[PDB]
Design a protein around this nucleic acid. Structure first.
Ligand SMILES: Cc1cn([C@H]2C[C@H](O)[C@@H](COP(=O)(O)OP(=O)(O)[C@H](Cl)P(=O)(O)O)O2)c(=O)[nH]c1=O
Ligand SMILES: [Cl-]
Ligand SMILES: [Mg+2]
Ligand code: NA
Ligand code: NA
Ligand code: NA
Length: 326
DNA sequence: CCGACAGCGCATCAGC
DNA sequence: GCTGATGCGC
DNA sequence: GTCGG
């Protein structure tokens, strides 16, 4: 909140570069800048002060001086006024519509929520569901509701096979008082790095959650990753809860620590951590941490028996999930 | 000045 | 049908 | 857009 106006501005610029310019490096640069400023514990008085932070360079420094002087940025003011950019930006807020589809729809004169609804036949499945719950997916999930959803998912999973372990990750595991969605990491001893001893491991779980009407819709589904929609049950006479996004990722049981580090995030925390790993001569994914040879070619997986082990390898002090919200 | 910027699952398409 | 590129998502 | 080398 200390530098909320600045980080909002940068986020708006990031979104512009992603959705309209389709300049993903500019997008990621703006988000990095916004992140480093958000955790900076002083109210920023100048661009030069902000430029001391890594990730803030000359251009963002100048923007920050304008914003501090006047409370706005002319570049953003003009972007806001531009119909095509505003339209493109809006359409990407539908799950499954990205920068390319958004611009394509705008070209055909499909540029409002109303246009989308009347042109449902021109959407793929993911987009159609994204449009169906557009309102709901805008809403945050209070932590108290996340606790209920967790109870339901862990108990239902236990009913399918008591050897499943389901772990809620994402912002929830980072201790947030509200989340954008629910992220569930799933393991079963039958699925390891070495073998898949039984099939349908993800399916049976999804099927059980569909059976008790917790999962209501599917955006995408594969053997290890489910992306869909869920809803808490409501009591008699009470308004229904909003429909929520849910992600479920099944990871080899012996690779749980790399898996839970990944799915706990944040996304920018993962990006910084993995970038750092590279500078230290390692590569990290949701399965393994591996050394980089002289080549650049990845070596064999290093042994890992905790999240801290991964931090150790790259010479980072351990950071608790709650300090990983970047 | 220049190249690199994290790493990967699922849906959809062109080409064969 | 398969393989690889592309889009969108985590 | 930023930064290390
Ligand atoms: C989008 C993304 C996610 N992840 C990892 C790290 C992420 O933490 C994890 C879940 O993605 P999420 O989109 O649900 O992120 P979250 O942290 O739960 C969000 Cl603050 P919210 O859902 O509360 O709004 O996946 C990445 O490693 N790279 C990414 O680009
Ligand atoms: Cl770019
Ligand atoms: Mg989440
Ligand atoms: Na800087
Ligand atoms: Na979208
Ligand atoms: Na998610």
């Amino acid at each position: 909140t200390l530098n909320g106006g600045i980080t909002d501005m940068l986020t708006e610029l990031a979104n512009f570069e992603k959705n309209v310019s389709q300049a993903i490096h500019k997008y990621n640069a703006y988000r990095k800048a916004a992140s480093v400023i958000a955790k900076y514990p002083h109210k920023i008085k100048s661009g030069a002060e902000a430029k001391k932070l890594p990730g803030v360079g000359t251009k963002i420094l100048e923007k920050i001086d304008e914003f501090l002087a006047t409370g706005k940025l002319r570049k953003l003011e003009k972007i806001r006024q531009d119909d095509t950019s505003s339209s493109i930006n809006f359409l990407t807020r539908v799950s499954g519509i990205g920068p390319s589809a958004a611009r394509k729809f705008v070209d055909e004169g499909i540029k409002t929520l109303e246009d989308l609804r009347k042109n449902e036949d021109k959407l793929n499945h993911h987009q159609r569901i994204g449009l169906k719950y557009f309102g709901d997916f805008e809403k945050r999930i209070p932590r108290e509701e996340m606790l209920q959803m967790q109870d339901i998912v862990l108990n239902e999973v236990k009913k399918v096979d008591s050897e499943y372990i389901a772990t809620v990750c994402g912002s929830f595991r980072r201790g947030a008082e509200s989340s954008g969605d629910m992220d569930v990491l799933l393991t079963h001893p039958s699925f390891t790095s070495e073998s898949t001893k039984q099939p349908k491991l993800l399916h049976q779980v999804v099927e059980q959650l569909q059976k008790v009407h917790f999962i209501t819709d599917t955006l995408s589904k594969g053997e290890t990753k489910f992306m869909g929609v869920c809803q808490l049950p409501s009591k008699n006479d009470e308004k229904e809860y909003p429909h929520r996004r849910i992600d479920i990722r099944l990871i080899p049981k012996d690779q749980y620590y790399c898996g839970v580090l990944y799915f706990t995030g944040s996304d920018i925390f993962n990006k910084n951590m993995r970038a750092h790993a590279l500078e230290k001569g390692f590569t990290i994914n949701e399965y393994t941490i591996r050394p980089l040879g002289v080549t650049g070619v990845a070596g064999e997986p290093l042994p890992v028996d905790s999240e801290k082990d991964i931090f150790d390898y790259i010479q980072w002090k351990y950071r608790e999930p709650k300090d990983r919200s970047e």
